[PDB]
Amino acid sequence: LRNKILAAISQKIPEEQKINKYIEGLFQSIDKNHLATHVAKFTETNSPGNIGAYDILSSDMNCGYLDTANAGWKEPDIVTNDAKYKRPQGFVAMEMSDGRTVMEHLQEDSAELRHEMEELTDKYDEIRDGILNMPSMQPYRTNQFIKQVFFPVGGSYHLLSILPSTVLNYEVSDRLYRSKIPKIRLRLLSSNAASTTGSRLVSKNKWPLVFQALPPKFLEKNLAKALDKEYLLPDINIDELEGVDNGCLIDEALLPLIIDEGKRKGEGNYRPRHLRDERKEETVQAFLDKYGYCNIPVGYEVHHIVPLSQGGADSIKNMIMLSIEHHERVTEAHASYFKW
Amino acid sequence: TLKSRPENLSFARCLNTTEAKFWQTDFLKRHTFKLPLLITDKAVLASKGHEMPPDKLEKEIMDPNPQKSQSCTLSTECDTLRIDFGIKVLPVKESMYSCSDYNYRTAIYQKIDEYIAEDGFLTLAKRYVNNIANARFLWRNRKGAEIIETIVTIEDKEYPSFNSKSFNLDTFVEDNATINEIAQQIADTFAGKREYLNIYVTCFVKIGCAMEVYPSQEMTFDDDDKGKKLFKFEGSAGMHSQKINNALRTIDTWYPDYTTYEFPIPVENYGAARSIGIPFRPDTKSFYKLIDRMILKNEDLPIEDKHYVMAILIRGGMFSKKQEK
Amino acid sequence: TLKSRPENLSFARCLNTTEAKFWQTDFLKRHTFKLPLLITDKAVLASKGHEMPPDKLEKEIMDPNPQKSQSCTLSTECDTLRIDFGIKVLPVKESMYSCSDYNYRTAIYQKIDEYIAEDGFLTLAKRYVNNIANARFLWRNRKGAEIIETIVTIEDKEYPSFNSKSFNLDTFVEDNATINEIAQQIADTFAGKREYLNIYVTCFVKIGCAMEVYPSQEMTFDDDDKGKKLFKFEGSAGMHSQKINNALRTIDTWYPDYTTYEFPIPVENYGAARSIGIPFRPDTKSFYKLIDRMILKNEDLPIEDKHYVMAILIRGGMFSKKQE
Amino acid sequence: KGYILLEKVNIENANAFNNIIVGIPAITSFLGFARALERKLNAKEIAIRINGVGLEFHEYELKGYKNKRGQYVTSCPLPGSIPGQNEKKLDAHIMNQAYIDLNMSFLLEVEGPHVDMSTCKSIKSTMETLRIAGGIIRNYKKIRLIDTLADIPYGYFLTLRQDNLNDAAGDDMLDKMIHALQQEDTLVPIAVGFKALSEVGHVEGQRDPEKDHCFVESIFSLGGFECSKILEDINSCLWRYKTEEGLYLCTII
DNA sequence: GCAAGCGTACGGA
DNA sequence: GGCCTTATTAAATGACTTCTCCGTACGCTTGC
């Protein structure tokens, strides 16, 4: 089995040279790769070099919060700066005849793996030692591409650099694949982009599942909610109606038009009180200013051509000023039509 | 002297634009009447007509091909598309959200003050206002309309309706009085004579009854639905904010080949313009080389190159030193 | 110079077409009177009449078969169907939606200008206007109508109506005055001598009282309702814009086998007709090889191949070439 | 002390993606916004300080659509030129991201000598220059002082739920979250803060070369929604900063 | 003469 | 206060588009 898998990946070269090529690239690549749990290149592939951390801690299992210390991630991640050193991550992930990983068989130094590898190379002891003694990835620098965030401490500010976590991303993406929780799949990374993050787990987990932390469903925006916050205006213009002057209805004869405009706009557009426009004194004042009044003239009242309860906006374009008796007549007609 | 750029120069975008809703109306009632415009699902059966190698072609050529799609159409009763969108302008100097070298920060502030003395920001502000006046933000929706009106509202003052169809998209107009006034307001905002400015734009396009309308596509990746998905904004059709902004950023006619390419392009660090397969500013004219020459070498660049550099500062972006291991 | 067709190349639809809305009417009153035509839900008890292998057949042959459906039918008072839809013609030269090589853009503009010198767009425009006059967009609704009257309106000028029964679908008429007057405006629009042209048409089909009407059916993708769903536009029945545009595109009589079939096919990249399952232009005269021969090889194609090429540019499409 | 409400602010394209979570931004995003508002006011010598924040949701729209299977699919903007070795090419790499639009009202708990309508007008003139979680403030109804829980307009506050998380089935902390969410459908996970992955120091490349620096992992927890008509103590929704020897935490006290 | 810019394999659940 | 019907059946044949979304050392070539 294993020799066929090794052969199957190594290009199209004749048999003996292609196996030796794979072992040569493997042995060269081991020193370039590191053991880690956080990977700066996961948020942005352009940050140069290895930046990441290997969090050993386990204490916080009932502190009321989740992190890579107090969640049981099972698989250690392996990371490189460059995809052309990535081969050991594939080599280690191969399954032997028992279906267990080369990692397990290496940790056991199992006689099966020793026999398999010694039939292909004498370097097996050094390959095993290198793989098992990979250094931990240590942060040593920062870049424009890492997310850098100020956090207040006692009126001073610390400068946090946020590293994403790959062990948790793999673990959560696994466990949500097998649970009913509301979840979203991110499907954005290409295979090439995922490879250049240089992680093993990110190459396995290029399209992760993640928690859908959204408000209650009734608070989703919809057209019904949106139309409830857009307001009606009348179609007539009080600056052009013969029988209106200085914003005041001067002719009685137009009253059926104002009534009909209110009816025609109002039908079915009821707004409950908490959603209605507030009648604002600023609007009435600006209306009076447009026509040069200091105050509402004696015996007149300012009316909304479309009632505010039936969708009308509190705006100059919706106001008209009526005499008290005409105001009463229009109010009575609208109350009769809308069943107030 | 300044050796090199700082490790973390970053500029926030100075000319912010919001998502636009579409509404539909009848042109003669447009001032008072509006109805929602809905994105409608429209699944489609195709023939297979894409370019195929001949050994595959003879197997595939006659097959039918279903495809999912979405499309947007005015009602049979309305005839005019309506767009409403907002803009917010912020001062250039105060938008520099980070810089890790106080010497460089001093130098860049000094050069911006020099530019405010040379121009304020009026020439750029004119070109941005002209791209509002051109109704270039309509993109494909401009390709045919009987009448177009653009109404610009600044802090509840309403300016007169531009007949936006009268402008040639290749030519910027210096002398329209309303463009000049709004451009002065914007230039005052960029120079820091005000801390902010809100501009609300309404635009009306009289297309015709039941004619098609083009909101921007979403970009989404899904296993099944490769079909066209349009941008629903609060259930009504809308335009992505970035596409309107990219319409406004088409001020640039200063790139070196311009005598052979008489059209303007989007302001970009290397003059990359997605309609043409080659960046218009590789090498010596690219933004990095110009700003380095202006600040590290203190050369007095010609005014066109200051226009371009300051236009990229208005664009905003991430401008650090080339990072190292 | 030009090594290959660009990384990206797209042409916008030049003969933009609206959805079509159905109405119902009585033919004598038709200028004054229209009612909505609705789509009625149905469900239907079929028989298992499909072809079955014998071991299945002898077990299920007699079973009933209930099915979901929808249908559209005129009222018991009206007797004519009415179709309203619009067209919006755009310039062909300014239709090129994306490119990746300014040399290629210059070359294609040069070839369109050369075509506008060799000919108008008139010879295509007359065929599109013929397919309006032919009432091909009726599709199944054309079968067995008594009289068909098509009215073309261009920005509040109404042209004298077409008696669409009189046109043999296999022939395109060159000398009808109304067809030529509409086609001149379309040709002026395609050449870029005008910025746009909105054409609205009203088509009256006298079917018969209470008879069935055939809107375009909806596509479904293994949806839980597998049964026939019909297209509703603004609640009344309608036709997809795609199906009307396809009816109008049936102008092509330049494919090579034409003298043995003598009927026009839809303008298509390979000339894949759907009513007949053999493609009429694979290989040597497929669109890709003709446009590449016209531009990359700069060869002066015969005028009928230029007609076909320009008809595909009118259709619009994606012609991007992958670069190795 | 006093309480200022920023009423029904509309946010476009808030940064919705965290390493484990898509949706509601990190709590630190909102509290950092409040701190930025404090710094802007203080630079004008208004001398206000803002000790805590209450977050009330009114509407949301995740940039995306629902599959027929009900799951959301997240939208991206087409990326522009990204700095680094490949920046010249017209096509640029697509990284993990998601964006959400929010309609939200912010309660602020305030110290100051002149907490009044003038400092509300100063907030009004200040807030136009800021962002929320990288999102753009399109509009807001009003800024006002408030005195009682009857003043807040109807909406839903977001509050911490450490109790439900600790009381969950005890196999593992991620299993505690999973079981809690599977038992209590109204609760949601949230990013709460940061854990130091390395001791405080200075390193090359800092945003500022002169403020002490840490590498950190995001801390997550479980939270839940409470109607403002059902709140009893105003303090039950006021998120505040806390620091503990290498934990950087938002919390409610 | 010395350092910056560019074409290219390299690698992979 | 009692109850909400028993059987039979859920089709066939074809199709699910093409394009872009990769960082890097290695060393060879051009510019200062």
Residue numbers in the entry:
A (entry chain G): 1 to 340
B (entry chain A): 11 to 335
C (entry chain B): 11 to 334
D (entry chain H): 3 to 255
What did the publication describing this PDB structure actually write?
Canonical prokaryotic type I CRISPR-Cas adaptive immune systems contain a multicomponent effector complex called Cascade, which degrades large stretches of DNA via Cas3 helicase-nuclease activity. Recently, a highly precise subtype I-F1 CRISPR-Cas system (HNH-Cascade) was found that lacks Cas3, the absence of which is compensated for by the insertion of an HNH endonuclease domain in the Cas8 Cascade component. Here, we describe the cryo-EM structure of Selenomonas sp. HNH-Cascade (SsCascade) in complex with target DNA and characterize its mechanism of action. The Cascade scaffold is complemented by the HNH domain, creating a ring-like structure in which the unwound target DNA is precisely cleaved.
We determined the cryo-EM structure of target DNA-bound SsCascade containing Cas5/6/7/8 proteins and a processed crRNA at 3.48Å resolution (Map A). The head part is capped by Cas6 binding to the crRNA 3′-hairpin region. The trunk runs along the crRNA spacer region supported by six Cas7 molecules (Cas7.1–7.6). The tail part consists of a Cas5-Cas8 heterodimer which accommodates the crRNA 5′-handle region and the PAM-containing DNA duplex. Starting from the PAM-proximal region, an 18-nt target strand DNA base-pairing with crRNA and a 2-nt non-target strand DNA are observed in the density map, while the remaining DNA part of a putative R-loop and the cleavage sites-containing DNA duplex are disordered. The C-terminal HNH domain of Cas8 is located between the head and tail parts and is clearly observed in Map A, the head-focused refinement map, but not in Map B, the overall refinement map. The PAM-containing DNA duplex is surrounded by a positively charged vise consisting of the Cas8 N-terminal domain, Cas5 thumb, and Cas7.6 fingers. The N2 of the dG(−2) nucleotide in the target strand is recognized by Asp82Cas8, explaining the second C preference in the 5′-NCN-3′ PAM. The SsCascade HNH, consisting of an anti-parallel β-sheet (β1–2) and surrounding three ɑ-helices (ɑ1–3), folds into a canonical ββɑ-metal structural motif with the conserved functional residues His304Cas8, Asn318Cas8, and His327Cas8. The apical part of the HNH, especially ɑ1, ɑ3, and β1–2, has extensive contacts with the ɑ-helix (ɑ2) in the C-terminal RNA-binding domain of Cas6, while the HNH side and base are supported by the Cas7.1 web and Cas7.6 palm.
